[PDB]
Amino acid sequence: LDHEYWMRHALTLAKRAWDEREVPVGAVLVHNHRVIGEGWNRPIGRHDPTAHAEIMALRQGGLVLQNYRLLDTTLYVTLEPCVMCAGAMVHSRIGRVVFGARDAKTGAAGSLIDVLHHPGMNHRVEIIEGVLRDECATLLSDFFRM
């Protein structure tokens, strides 16, 4: 579905997070080839431990759809989702998550844990990884070097 076109927008949002001095992750939630939520990482600034990119984008999606269930959506994100965000995607009943770089240490879509296909969740999210992978990694690498 030209996943790079949507990931590019996510990288755009990640660079907002970068300008805010937050770990640079961006996310966009797409429904019928239209954006219905955007998010970027801002826990430090918002004083909000839950203010990850995915959480912000899933919340917008709910407002836009007037529904807490976000059926058949695709969530794009520049980094593999953490446990908190992976659980949110499961509650949201999204169709699919597409991510850029793996989070080898604490990623929760097959890196540390695979919450999205854990055998007791009432909903399965499909996974596609590595979209604009090197672009997503370099943002995060330059961040940590900084």
Catalytic residue flag (residue 54): yes
Separation CA 69–CA 103 (nearest Å) = 26
Residues in contact with 47: Cβ distance below 8 Å, sequence separation at least 6, in sequence order: none
Angle at 13 (CA atoms; ends 29, 1), nearest 5 degrees: 45
SS3 28: strand
Closest to 125 (Cα-Cα) out of 114, 134, 116, 138 = 116
What is the footprint of a copy of itself within residues 2-41 (CB under 8 A)? none
- Of 50 and 138, nearer to a copy of itself (C-beta) is 50
Separation CA 11–CA 18 (nearest Å) = 10
Question: How many chain residues bind a copy of itself (CB under 8 A)?
Answer: 40
Q: Which stretch binds a copy of itself (CB under 8 A): 9-17, 23-31, 63-71, 138-146?
A: 63-71
- Of 65 and 137, nearer to a copy of itself (C-beta) is 65
Residues that bind a copy of itself (CB under 8 A): 43-44, 46-51, 55, 58-59, 62-63, 65-70, 82-88, 90-93, 105-106, 108, 112-113, 115, 118, 120-122
Binding positions: 52, 54, 82, 85
